[PDB]
Design a protein around this nucleic acid. Structure first.
Lengths: 292, 93, 65, 49, 48, 1114, 49
DNA sequence: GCATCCGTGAATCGAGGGTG
DNA sequence: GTGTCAGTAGCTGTCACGGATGC
RNA sequence: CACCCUCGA
């Protein structure tokens, strides 16, 4: 195990001296921002407090070196600088964490990357997306398997730029700017125009938890009145979705490649069988099997 | 398109090569003028201007001065976007 | 906290860029910047700027801004 | 371990006071360990992924 | 068994059962008592 | 009759067991606690009649523990006494309006005693604004009603634990002496058969170290603990010996880095465990210890501190428990069993309510002030010092503000409907300071414990991550001054049931055996059957002879909560669906008009009344003048009291709290009668929903698994309509370039959008506003150096920007109220604000597709279709049903209640008439004579675990009343023949038809619908915001990325993680390409990944991106 | 090392990555998902791309 | 050569409200 | 400029598991 | 935005 560490420094060509620091970097300000409160007071990032404590102790070290303070003070101050830089990089790693106001351990640079709230899992493996919505789901028996019914007010916002384009084309609006104002004021012209936009433009429906890939499926959107999403009764099994307050999220594919992927790979009608067992899922399951 | 992502130990020389200046003073900002203190954790000479093409001393507030290092406050004149990428550093005694 | 969505500004520039093709290359090269480079007068500047603006204003209000 | 005393009543007959109270241990622990089982399952899933 | 058994299998852990196995094919040597259990195998071909 | 005490409607009950004690004040948990805290006359009379000797109010206790204050010499002293309150600063509603705190000034009497001069100066000192509790048990902080939740903590005392080692497989034992305050002390037996002690988390010292520190000779130690080899081996394996040696050992392990003086250690080792300064067992702690060890069992609880005798007896108890001993008598003490304690048993699990939780904070503040006092004494002169110079009340007010403002127990009050608020005030929370962390709660703290019977409900508990950590106090339960939860029981003398009721604690209950409530009892009191169901110590249920029952339960519903007691036929529903029913009753939405349920339980009345959202007459009298605004009552003596109705008030959760008078002008009203009822109330009873005509049948798949079909009648007649009110707020601040001004003059805004605004820029009352409309016109001056080049050109080719208050997306209603505060007009705003406007918008929400309805049995569902009144399957006489529930989602959930509830429901709507001729039938022999005849729309009660039995219900269905035409619509089975309103042909088979009580839950599509094209992005990560209120987008999580990858939709995944998210240039080019009609451009690099690289650099890691050639690229 | 640092033991992985001076060949689903490249699977492989 | 103790990890999405 | 004693709160009410750490 | 609470599938 020791060789495992030593041969690395041997071959790579980097000196082990890097493990001991003579200078510490300062993270840009926008990544440690200081915001203002509605009461006139200020709130700041914990990194600012950590860096500030380190700077205070470092400047005190310079003072002590210049003043020829007793060796005891200089050494006992270098120790505190060590502990403060240790907290800056990974607070709480050694010993007791640096407590903030309220006996709350301050976040460190290494805390920015760990766990569900870390950068990797929270902001890299899964982002938040534009052109998306969510609403309550309702069973729609009359729908076809490849169809889903979304509210008008959902589609209008989702397809806002498309509606603006077609409103300025058909001369319902003088310029694209006034088209935006028209959509934001919900003028009656959009509802007839919106239908042309959503025509054969598939959307993606997702229900958390997304356990398997059939937890997301593509559908052709149908403008429905009301404010609930209308879902086909046969896909409930795949989503494991009952109708007692369940909510589903809608995503609008934009690029031509995205629309093709949704139309061919992810359309509900092309995913009737369970990928785990091969047995069908979109089949008569509850009331349907009873009638038959 | 870029092939590999290399990671390694940061030499002190690299730490200094990244930094646009050393953070000497421990102050943060001023609680009246909202201006970041010079050589502080928000020094505009080091990290960048608070507002686009606006220097600290207020001599250069226009876009005509693109790339001018102000002589009275030492702040460059680019977009505030650089406050998201310019690193500082503390030189340890 | 949080940064707004660049809709408006972008739509505005998308129009401004649509009323830039309705121009002549000289008014364009002038508006995109001065009398020291283009090698002309300052009155020629003031004017070309003046008439070029008025063409921009005319075009914009033609579209209904 | 199973209780040496059963729940004789049916939901059509009507549980006694103590019958309901004694059903609740198992019911609540059912919900609790279900939450825990789901947690461990999801973790195993991400590992396998 | 159960889900922890699935974890034991996927993590290559030293299982709870820790059942032994015949390292060499041969004749069984049941030497059962009550104090303890010891079992030997006489290799069907050569071996020890 | 049911609930014949205030003058309520005559609800008839199927009750077979009489109620010996009527339900207590459901709000006594908060009330009694606070009254004890401030020592009100009512609390003192309560303690006086209770037999208490020397009771102490909450403030008096703190002030006595503090008094006196002396320096190190003792030449100066300061003492406090007699706390009193002046009148309240501002009334409750005014506090809500003006965003201030409901409080009363606290006065105390302090006096300075000077020993070197022999003269005392005593005066009154104002201590601070003390937050006061409303009559409804709530506090008001900064204009918000909050509730202080009772906390389940670990009771002080001595506890023993038997753990099992993992590697050596031997039984180890440990002990913890948990005080009410101070350092902790835990003994243990490791796996080497040696005894040790950890003092305040510190290192584990040998148990003999402590004995040596106290002055005990090694030989006497061997004398006491010689019967065990483990203690002998401990004294042998000891390192140092000597009274003055182990003491310094303790000192250097407890307070390291200091010079060890023999007396410096002798001082603290006596102060940390035997002086009342830094260690104190409350009276309850001392009592608990005195029982567990069996010492001082006769002494009055006067020693508030631990003694050496206790430590010795404790170590003896431990060492004997380790080696199998089961009995022990302390030298000079009574015999006591040797066992381990549960720490979940409600005799060891204590409950501290509002009074105690506030007392601890006042204590912290008072100590923080005491130190400043001792410092200020030795600074000022010793003759011009007054209580006013020594007292700094800053930390006290700061302490109570820190508590109410920031505390897990000061919770935003649940104000959906009265029942929700009541339950909230009767909550028992295990989380919080001094208790435990959520990550520190195994599957054992959450499940039901046999001691919860009659104390904490086993049903009402959240099903989320807080399951088992939050309970509701049982109905008849109360809290004793010690903190434990008592419950009443009927004392059985000699196999005879007595009306003598006594309240027992958990451990007190275990020392006897109690019979179940529904035991057959003679009219005199003797049990009918020799064997009876009996609950026994350690939660053991078995039959026992009648001559063994000591006590028995008061009422069948003794074990359930208030909400749970509100479920009819509760005995026929499983605990899961019952949990959901009780939890969803608290989510009911107050309807425009409220209808009391036909099928009730009896608890509705007292729930509504004790909730406090109605108007009850304090004193009897007649109504002199009644209006929609107020009600004036002329008493008999001559005085007049006027109750003001709360009309269209915004609840904490947007519901409408609206009170309406019931009595009329000149109506005789008795004391305690409901003269006006509020939301979800009808004549004083909780009306959380409506009685709906239900048919149980599948219908064309629109009700498929748990979906609900409703009749448009409920829309046309506002049967399920509800009012919701939103509060909108904006302020005008001082900016760097001037000051934001609220003006009707807004740049580049038409006169058509501003047509509904007054001259100030504020919307006028009564105007209907859609989403996006201007409510308050505010413009803010923007500097010139902040303008886009295209913006500057557009300004040149043609200084304030629009910051008006617009209506958020999805909101719409009538503007009903406006409130304006101006710094110019004396209005005290936060520094930097000149004006503040609040606009109240009210919306009348009809039932819509997707709204969530539910019953009382966890039978929930959304509205999948609202058919016209003619399409609905209608009964024989033409009446169309109101709601269709799918049958398949009924027998799986084991909620037979609804079925029964349905049947009885119909019997209540139509009425019945039992054949009295030829005697009373054999099934109705047990029914009261009041039930043999019932008119249509009759009110009935099915008490929990009592009430209607299936046989009696069968009979009632046999004798249902006919309709107006003389026809009986439903069969004895309870089903009826329905006609399909769409085709006309009658449905082939009879269908169960009845009336069910359905509630409108607070989960409406009008609030839960959301969609986003673009919008705000977080500055750091450049990813779209979250939440509907911030106009955020949905989170494409990790599992969903796995879904995309599984489908192989590579381009869709990249699109999701680049141009649709945090590609700074890509998303803009996408917007442009959409409005241009061009194709979608190529995605760029996520800004979040740039942030990742910069963050890895911040940790001294040189991350670099290399091209195919090998050169690092920037 | 980027696919491992995003799984578990982030610090423990990045330390070893910096010591061994490891280079990440940006050719994996997790990695390209992080940096926003097309996943080398499905419609992302070179045959169909 | 081996028991102790350190550090790692522990489902997904969504709503509203409070304070520092 | 400072000058007699002058001295944390809080808390353990999670757990399984592997391997470096340490007696 | 940091934490906190309550809640929903």
């Amino acid at each position: 195990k020791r060789l495992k560490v030593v041969a690395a420094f041997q071959q790579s060509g980097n000196s082990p001296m890097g493990m001991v620091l003579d200078a510490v970097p300062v993270i840009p300000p926008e990544l440690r921002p200081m915001v203002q409160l509605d009461g006139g007071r200020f709130a700041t990032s914990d990194l600012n407090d950590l860096y500030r404590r380190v700077i205070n102790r470092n400047n005190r070290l310079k003072r002590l070196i210049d003043l020829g303070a007793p060796e005891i003070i200089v050494n006992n101050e270098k120790r505190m600088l060590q502990e403060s830089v240790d907290a800056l990089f990974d607070n709480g790693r050694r010993g007791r964490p640096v407590t903030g106001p309220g006996n709350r351990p301050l976040k460190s640079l290494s805390d920015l990357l760990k766990g569900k709230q870390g950068r990797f899992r929270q902001n890299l493996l899964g982002k938040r997306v534009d052109y998306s919505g969510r609403s309550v789901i309702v069973v729609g028996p009359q729908l076809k398997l490849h169809q889903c019914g979304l509210p008008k007010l959902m589609a209008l916002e989702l397809f806002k730029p498309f509606v603006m384009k077609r409103l300025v084309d058909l001369n319902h609006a003088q310029n694209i700017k006034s088209a935006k104002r028209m959509v934001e004021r919900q003028r009656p012209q959009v509802w007839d125009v919106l239908e042309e936009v959503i025509a054969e433009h598939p959307v993606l429906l997702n229900r958390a938890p997304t356990l398997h890939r059939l937890g997301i499926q593509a559908f052709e959107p149908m403008l429905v009145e009301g404010k609930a999403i209308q879902l086909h009764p046969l896909v409930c099994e795949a989503f494991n979705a009952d109708f007692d307050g369940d909510q589903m999220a809608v995503h609008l594919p934009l690029s031509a490649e995205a629309q093709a992927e949704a139309r061919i790979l992810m359309l509900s009608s092309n995913n009737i069988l369970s990928p785990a067992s091969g047995r069908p899922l979109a089949m008569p399951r509850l009331d349907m099997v009873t009638g038959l | 398109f870029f092939d590999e992502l290399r990671i390694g130990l940061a030499t002190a020389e690299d730490i200094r090569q990244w930094s646009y200046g050393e953070v000497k003073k421990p102050e943060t900002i001023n609680y009246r003028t909202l201006k970041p203190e010079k050589d502080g954790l928000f020094c505009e000479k080091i990290f960048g201007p608070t507002r686009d093409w606006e220097c600290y001393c207020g001599k250069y507030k226009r876009v005509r001065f693109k790339g001018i290092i102000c002589e009275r406050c030492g702040v460059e004149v680019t977009r505030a976007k650089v406050r998201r990428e310019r690193m500082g550093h503390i030189e340890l005694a | 906290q949080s940064t707004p969505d660049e809709v408006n500004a972008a739509l505005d520039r998308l129009l401004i860029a649509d009323a830039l093709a309705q121009l002549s290359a000289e008014h364009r090269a002038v508006i995109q910047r001065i009398a020291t480079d283009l090698g002309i007068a300052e009155g020629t500047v003031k004017s070309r700027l003046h008439y070029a603006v008025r063409a921009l204003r005319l075009t914009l209000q033609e579209l209904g801004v | 371990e199973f209780i040496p005393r059963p729940v004789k009543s049916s939901f059509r007959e009507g549980l006694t006071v103590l019958e309901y109270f004694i059903n609740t241990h198992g019911a609540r622990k059912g919900l609790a360990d279900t939450a825990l089982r789901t947690a461990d399952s999801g973790y195993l899933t991400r590992r396998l992924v | 068994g159960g889900l922890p058994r699935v974890q034991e299998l996927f993590e290559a852990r030293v299982p709870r059962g820790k059942a032994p196995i015949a390292d060499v094919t041969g004749r069984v040597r049941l030497e059962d008592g009550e104090r303890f259990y010891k079992i030997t195998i006489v290799p069907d071909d050569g071996g020890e | 009759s049911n609930n014949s005490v205030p003058g309520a409607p005559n609800r008839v009950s199927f009750a077979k067991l009489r109620e010996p004690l009527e339900v207590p004040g459901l709000l006594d948990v908060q009330t009694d606690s606070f009254e004890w805290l401030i020592g009100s006359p009512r609390w003192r009379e309560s303690a006086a009649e209770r037999g208490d000797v020397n009771p102490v109010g909450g403030l008096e206790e703190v002030l006595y523990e503090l008094s006196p204050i002396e320096d190190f010499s003792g030449s100066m002293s300061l003492s406090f006494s007699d706390p009193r309150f002046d009148d309240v600063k501002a009334p409750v509603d005014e506090c809500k309006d003006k965003d201030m705190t409901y409080a009363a000034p606290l006065f105390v009497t302090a006096e300075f005693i000077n020993n070197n001069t022999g003269e005392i100066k005593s005066q009154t000192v104002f201590m601070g604004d003390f937050p006061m509790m409303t009559e409804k048990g709530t506090f008001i902080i900064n204009g918000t009603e909050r509730v202080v939740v009772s906390q389940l903590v670990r009771s002080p005392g001595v506890y023993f634990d038997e753990t099992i080692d993992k590697s050596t497989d031997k039984t180890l034992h440990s002990v913890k002496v948990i005080p009410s305050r101070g350092a902790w002390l835990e003994f243990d037996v490791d796996k080497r058969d040696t005894v040790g002690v950890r003092i305040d988390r510190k290192r584990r010292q040998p148990v003999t170290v402590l004995l040596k520190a106290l002055g005990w000779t090694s030989e006497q130690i061997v004398e006491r603990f010689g019967f065990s080899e483990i203690m002998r081996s401990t004294l042998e394996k000891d390192n140092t010996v000597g009274t003055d040696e182990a003491l310094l050992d303790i000192y250097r392990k407890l307070r390291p880095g200091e010079p060890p003086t023999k007396e410096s250690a002798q001082t603290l080792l006596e102060n940390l465990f035997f002086k009342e300064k830094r260690y104190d067992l409350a009276r309850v702690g001392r009592y608990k210890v005195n029982k567990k060890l069996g010492l001082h069992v006769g002494e009055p609880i006067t020693s508030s501190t631990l003694t050496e005798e206790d430590v010795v007896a404790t170590i003896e108890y431990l060492v004997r428990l380790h080696e199998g001993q089961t009995t022990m008598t302390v030298p000079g003490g009574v015999e006591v069993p040797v066992e381990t304690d549960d720490i979940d048993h409600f005799g060891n699990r204590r409950l501290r309510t509002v009074g105690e939780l506030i007392q601890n904070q006042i204590r912290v503040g008072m100590s923080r002030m005491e130190r400043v006092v001792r410092e200020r004494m030795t600074t000022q002169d010793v003759e011009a010092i007054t209580p006013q110079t020594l007292i700094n009340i800053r930390p006290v007010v700061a302490a109570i503000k820190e508590f109410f403002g920031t505390s897990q127990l000061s919770q935003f009050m649940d104000q959906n409907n009265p029942l929700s608020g009541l339950t909230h005030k009767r909550r028992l929370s295990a989380l919080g300071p001094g208790g435990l962390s959520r990550e520190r709660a195994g599957l054992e703290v959450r499940d039901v414990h046999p001691s919860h019977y009659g104390r904490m409900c086993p049903i009402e508990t959240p099903e989320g991550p807080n399951i088992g950590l939050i309970g509701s106090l049982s109905v008849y339960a109360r809290v004793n001054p010690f903190g434990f939860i008592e419950t009443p029981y009927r004392k059985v003398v000699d196999g005879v049931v007595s009306d003598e009721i006594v309240y027992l604690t958990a451990d007190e209950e275990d020392r006897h055996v109690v019979a179940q409530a529904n035991s057959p009892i003679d009219a005199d009191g003797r049990f009918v059957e020799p064997r009876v169901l009996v609950r026994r110590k350690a939660g053991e249920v078995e039959y026992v002879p009648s001559s063994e029952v000591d006590y028995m339960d008061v009422s069948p519903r003794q074990m359930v909560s208030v909400a749970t007691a509100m479920i009819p036929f509760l005995e026929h529903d499983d605990a899961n669906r019952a949990l959901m029913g009780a939890n969803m009753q608290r989510q009911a939405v107050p309807l425009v008009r409220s209808e009391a349920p036909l099928v009730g339980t009896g608890m509705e009345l007292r729930a509504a009344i004790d909730a406090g959202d109605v108007v009850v007459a304090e004193e009897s009298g007649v109504i002199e003048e009644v209006s929609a605004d107020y009600i004036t009552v002329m008493h008999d003596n001559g005085t007049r009291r006027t109750y003001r109705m709360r009309k269209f008030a915004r609840s904490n959760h947007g519901t409408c709290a609206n009170q309406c008078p019931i009595v009329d002008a000149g109506d005789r009203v008795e004391a305690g009668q409901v003269i006006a009822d509020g939301p979800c109330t009808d004549d004083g009873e909780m009306a959380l929903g409506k009685n709906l005509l239900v048919a149980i049948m599948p219908w064309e798949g629109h009700n498929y698994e748990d979906a609900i079909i409703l009749s448009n009648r409920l829309v046309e007649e506002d049967v399920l309509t509800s009012i919701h009110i939103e509060e909108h707020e904006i302020d005008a601040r001082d900016t760097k370039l001037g000051a934001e001004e609220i003006t009707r003059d807004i740049p580049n805004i038409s006169d058509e959008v501003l047509a509904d605004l007054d001259e100030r820029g504020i919307v006028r009352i009564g105007a209907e506003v859609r989403d996006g409309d201007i409510l308050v016109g505010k413009v803010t001056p923007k500097g010139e150096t902040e303008l886009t080049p295209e913006e500057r050109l557009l300004r040149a080719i043609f200084e304030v920007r629009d910051t008006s208050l617009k209506v958020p997306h999805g909101e719409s209603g009538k503007v009903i109220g406006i409130r304006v505060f101006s710094r110019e007009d004396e209005d005290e705003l936060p520094a930097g604000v000149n004006e503040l406007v609040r606009v109240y918008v009210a919306q009348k929400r009809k039932i819509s597709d997707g709204d969530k309805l539910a019953g009382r049995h966890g039978n929930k569902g959304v509205i999948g279709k609202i058919l016209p009144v003619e399409d609905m399957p209608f009964l024989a006489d033409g009446t169309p049903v109101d709601i269709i529930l799918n049958t398949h989602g009924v027998p799986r959930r084991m909620n037979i209640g609804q079925i029964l509830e349905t049947h009885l429901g119909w019997c209540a709507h139509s009425g019945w008439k039992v054949d009295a001729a030829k005697g009373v039938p054999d099934w109705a022999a047990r029914l009261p004579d009041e039930l043999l005849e019932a008119q249509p729309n009759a009110i009935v009660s099915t008490p929990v675990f009592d009430g209607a039995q299936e046989a009696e219900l069968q009979g009632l269905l046999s004798c249902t009343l006919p309709n107006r035409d003389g026809d009986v619509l439903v069969d004895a089975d309870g089903k009826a023949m329905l006609f399909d309103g769409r085709s006309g042909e009658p449905f082939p088979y009879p269908v169960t038809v009845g009336y069910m009580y359905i509630m409108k839950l607070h989960h409406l599509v009008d609030d839960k619908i959301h969609a986003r094209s673009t919008g705000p992005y977080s500055m750091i990560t450049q990813q779209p915001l979250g939440g509907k209120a911030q106009f955020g987008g949905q989170r494409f999580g990790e599992m969903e990325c796995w879904a995309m990858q599984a489908y192989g939709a590579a381009y869709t995944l990249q699109e999701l993680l680049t141009i649709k998210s945090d590609d700074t240039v890509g998303r803009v080019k996408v917007y442009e390409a959409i409005v241009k009609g061009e194709n979608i451009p190529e995605p760029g690099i996520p800004e979040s990944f740039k942030v990742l690289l910069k963050e890895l650099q911040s940790l001294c890691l040189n991350v670099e991106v290399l091209s195919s050639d090998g050169a690092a690229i920037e | 090392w980027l696919s491992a640092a995003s799984f578990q033991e982030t610090t423990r992985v990045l330390t070893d990555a910096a010591i061994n001076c490891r280079s990440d060949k940006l050719n994996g689903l997790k990695e390209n998902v992080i940096i926003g490249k097309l996943i080398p699977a499905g419609t992302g492989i070179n045959r169909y791309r």
